[PDB]
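Appendix B: complex inputs.
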Amino acid sequence: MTGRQARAPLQFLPDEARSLPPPKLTDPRLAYIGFLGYCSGLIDNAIRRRPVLSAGLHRQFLYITSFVFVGYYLLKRQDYMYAVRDHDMFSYIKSHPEDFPEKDKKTYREVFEEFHPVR
Amino acid sequence: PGIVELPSLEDLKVQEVKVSSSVLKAAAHHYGAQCDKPNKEFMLCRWEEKDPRRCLEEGKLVNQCALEFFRQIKRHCAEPFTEYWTCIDYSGLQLFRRCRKEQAQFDKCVLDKLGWVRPDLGELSKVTKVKTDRPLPENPYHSRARPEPNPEVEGDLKPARHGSRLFFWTM
Amino acid sequence: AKTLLHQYWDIPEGTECHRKTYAATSIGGASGLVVSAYSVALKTPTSFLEGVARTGRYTFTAAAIGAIFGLTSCISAQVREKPDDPLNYLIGGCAGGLTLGARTRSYGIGAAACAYMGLTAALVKMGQLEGWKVFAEPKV
Amino acid sequence: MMTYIVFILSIIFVMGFVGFSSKPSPIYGGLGLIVSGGVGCGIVLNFGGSFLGLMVFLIYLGGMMVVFGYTTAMATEQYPSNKVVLGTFITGLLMEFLMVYYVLKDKEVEIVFKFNGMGDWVIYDTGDSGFFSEEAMGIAALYSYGTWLVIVTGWSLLIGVVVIMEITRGN
Amino acid sequence: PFFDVQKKLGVDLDHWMTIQSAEQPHRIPARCHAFEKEWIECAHGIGSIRAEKECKIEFEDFRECLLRQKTMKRLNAIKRQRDKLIKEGKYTPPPHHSG
Amino acid sequence: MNLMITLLTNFTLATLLVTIAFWLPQPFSMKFFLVAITFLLFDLEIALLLPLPWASQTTNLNTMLTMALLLIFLLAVSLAYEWTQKGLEW
Amino acid sequence: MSLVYMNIMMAFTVSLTGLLMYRSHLMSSLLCLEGMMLSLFILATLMILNSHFTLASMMPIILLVFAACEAALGLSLLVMVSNTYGTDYVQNLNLLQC
Amino acid sequence: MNPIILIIILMTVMLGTIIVMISTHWLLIWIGFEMNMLAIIPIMMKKHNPRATEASTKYFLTQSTASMLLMMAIIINLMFSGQWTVMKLFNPMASMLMTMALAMKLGMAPFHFWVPEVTQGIPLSSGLILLTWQKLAPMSVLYQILPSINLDLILTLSILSITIGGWGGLNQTQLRKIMAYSSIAHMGWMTAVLLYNPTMTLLNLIIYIIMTSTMFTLFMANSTTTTLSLSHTWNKAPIMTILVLITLLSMGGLPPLSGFMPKWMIIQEMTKNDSIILPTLMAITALLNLYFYMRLTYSTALTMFPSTNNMKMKWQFPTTKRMTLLPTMTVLSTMLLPLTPILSILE
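Resulting structure:
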């Protein structure tokens, strides 16, 4: 799928993106990103021979902060992209009733399907 | 497809001003003064319709105006107008600073005997109004209509419908 | 090229025969010239007679495989009188692989070529029979 | 000495490209590219061509083939024609003779095109009021409108200078 | 990807080298000015697919302004016909300078 | 073709002079290369400069002054760079 | 179709085949690259002149100056190869096998 | 080399690639490609061995003829309907010449003969920067000019590049040639889905660039040319071994790991069309180019080759290489599996 109003330049978060619900505090995806940041600081201790779980606690706090921040912005952009996809889908549904006909519900009193037994 | 609509040979007979080039170049400024008032009709016709085979009556009009002007300068002073343009003729491309004293002589002739102040610089410029009799044309670029407009997508956006709607990672 | 592969597949198969074998020999000559052109570009034969010999060998073998494929195609289509199966071209691909092994004069290569060329030829006719487009929709 | 002089100078042009695409010694190659550049200058001046074709002449026939012949003189020796070189020259002359013969005695020659085969006095201007030789005022832009283009061009040449000195032992 | 800082900063630094009919430094046209103006106005608010299937007539008019292919084909046919009938000899030609 | 007539007459008369003069009596250094490429790059920058006297009659004069000074200034920076950084030394 | 364009495109194919097949010296290859450059220059210049494409008539000279400094870089690379070797053949480059 | 000069050359590589990204004029795209070449030439020959000199010669010749054939395609575009807008082209012949020009620009099957030769005789930093920016620079252009390309061009080059980077690749222990054949196979993948949904192509470009940065950073952490040197890296340090394991398996693309995500989405938005036999052929060849990854892993971290002493000497010195950014790129490149709906972060 393509832009869809790249006219209207790049615009990392549009001004229409302040109508969607934001990602809340302690949402599990950014909790996973914080766990990944903790593991990143831990392997950062592990590359050089500095000891694990200690003597790098400011780096742990730094990597947690930075990754949770970046993941928060990307979660907001992700929610906006799914919202604009759903609204464009429903707009093209409502725009042309001629090509998407309503399937009248043939209930199972009259729908015929064969049997083909497994013995 | 479509054929052109050429004018006839009956409109293609104006008394052509079969004069030479240096005399026509030296006789330019006072021709801009006395005549060249009703040929901006022709200029506005040419720039409101990009179509000669249509503005040719005004071409016949500027042709007869220039011939009338050269008749009027032919009958009266100067006959040393001939001396002035043959003084300016053989000087390569005709610089007007070449034969300046005889330019003053021709100006003094035409001023003291006929009138016709020379247009000072820069008065052969300075964008000029013109009224006509014909009404101004519409859409001379003969084209069709602008075929389809894009329906402009507006309206305040809903949130996502049941998440990504991919395989999984719902919400 | 599209024109001669279209000439090959335009024949009802079916029997409109020996035009099938002529088109298959044209396919073989073209493919042999392709692969021989890459080989003579990437070998420097020295002498040039060796280069002409290698290109002639490649074109001759690919044209022979195409000819034998078309011959047993036509014969199996006339005999079985059932133009819809891929089993006839399975026989075709195995015959082409066997004669590839004959013209390279080793037999294990001929056996593996029988198996793989038979499977690919059955798949080609089978995909033409159901209808699987060349390379694309390219729509969505 | 006649109408198809643009076509004939194009024949000598493609002959020159064949004449150094046959791979001679590179000073003969520089000679062939100088002759080809001179007749290409002739072609573009036949289209007129007032500035750009005299402008290429200082760069390629003024600054580039000089250094190509310089580097031919200082780097390679080639101290002593051959079958392959002159045979490719023969086949190139044969291909040009065949193409121009089929242009001459037929309608059109198609590689995959439709080249309407006759000499080009068409198309050309219908004697407009040029007055400034439109190439001249076109290239007399680039300093009002040309903000970005000349900046990145000069910047690329500066980076070319530092690249050349680095590869030839910067600093 | 293609980005849009060109539109975002408000400096249209590269849109003037782009087409004809943008304002030349002296206000002169090209050879096919009006054909461009009507073609651009035909295919402006358009999603470049009904541009392919709807503005075809004016696009072909613009292309034959730009190259003049079939007009030269007609003129060349006239030249070849003129050559073969002067080879025939009927009406030793008064289409040049006189009757 | 008028200057082509002049070129033809000069070329033919020169060939007449030469052929009637002839039928009648009977390693390298990098320093060689740096100056030529320096010529080439500054000559291309001359090619960028030289439409300046074409351009000096427009309605944008301060900008023309600024970018013309920018072109000669860049050329001077290149000159002074290869000047200071032992580009032309012996 | 302005018939000369056919000859200049055929001249482009001449210079392109001369760029691709080349026997001994890299200098002939680089000079045929320059010939290809001249071909594009002339072809585009005749097009822009007959179009009266007068606004953006920068293409001939700017295409020229850019691909000229490309040829300058090629000259420096050929000088470096000829400096670290005896000659500048296509041969004596068969080291670093693919 | 001066560090100021290297910062300048990096600035000009970034300038050329950003000019390729940002411009709308054809001359500016050609200038960006040429300036990218001119700047990337002295990153190679960073030492003065003749290997890098011959590699730079081959690279310059192929890159310059690709640039000039691109200019040929543009001047054909203005021989037809002529304007300098990066849009739909106006000739199948011009689009053919242009896509073959870009196929020479970035690693394709008829044109891949310079890639292992240019990567073998150069150091690791030059190979990293050439793979990253010389596989990033044409993708923007192809993303632009996709709506006027005959599909058989792109699809033929993609299929043949995937199978050549597969089959060529079972024979080299030169690690630069291994990574180059991997680059050919992945560029075939990243070009294949250009005419269906280019979001997949650009996401695959991001994932491939991050993976190759991880791999070359692991090789720059301890200078190796062969697999036996990697067995010595097994002896001297254990964490590099499990990194080689995870990054080689993510080049292999297995569904627990993040290298599988670019394959799977390609197969999805390819098979929503009527293309099924082409996905199963491409993914069989994706099974093929895992084998040299797997024998490399067998050589590095799982079996163990006999070692040489003076590794006893190298025990007394702890590691002191600087990594540019290894661990962030590693866990961004390998644990990215549950972030598949960061697909739509791109368009």
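Residues 22 and 67 of chain C are 7 Å apart (CA to CA).
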